[PDB]
Design a protein around this ligand. Structure first.
Ligand SMILES: [Cl-]
Ligand SMILES: [Cl-]
Ligand SMILES: [Cl-]
Ligand SMILES: [Cl-]
Ligand code: NA
Ligand SMILES: [Rh+3]
Ligand SMILES: [Rh+3]
Ligand SMILES: [Rh+3]
Ligand SMILES: [Rh+3]
Length: 129
């Protein structure tokens, strides 16, 4: 499913991400835009053979099982395919664990390079929230 910007903002809010670990909703929306362009089916292979899945590009090296990432963990206790669903529950719940890891949203390199320090509130401008 490809979300609209305000649709995703709404879904993220409903699932408790607005100011989760201190990150305002616009941070999460900005991260989603640059990680997946709001496409739940997004996948990208990493150089090390791990794969990133879903709206927030969660990595199989630590967070989900895809059966093809040697030596990896599955810390969200889910198949990586769960991260591709039109229902963002699995992605959000896993994101909450990631962001709680110690390094906040720096875990998402595109967040650090493209969202961090910017006017992230623009990402939720005009949404009925
Ligand atoms: Cl957009
Ligand atoms: Cl914001
Ligand atoms: Cl594996
Ligand atoms: Cl933080
Ligand atoms: Na894994
Ligand atoms: Rh929904
Ligand atoms: Rh808010
Ligand atoms: Rh890499
Ligand atoms: Rh399995």
């Amino acid at each position: 499913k490809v979300f609209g910007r305000c649709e995703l903002a709404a879904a993220m809010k409903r699932h408790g991400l607005d100011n989760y670990r201190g990150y305002s909703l616009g941070n999460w929306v900005c991260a989603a835009k640059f990680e997946s362009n709001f496409n739940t089916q997004a996948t990208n292979r990493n150089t090390d053979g791990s794969t990133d899945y879903g709206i927030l590009q969660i990595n199989s090296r630590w967070w989900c099982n895809d059966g093809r990432t040697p030596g990896s963990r599955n810390l969200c206790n889910i198949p990586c395919s769960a991260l591709l669903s039109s229902d963002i529950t699995a992605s959000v719940n896993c994101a909450k664990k990631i962001v709680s890891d110690g390094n906040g949203m720096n875990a998402w390199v595109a967040w650090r390079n493209r969202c961090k320090g910017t006017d992230v509130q623009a990402w939720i401008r005009g949404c009925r929230l």
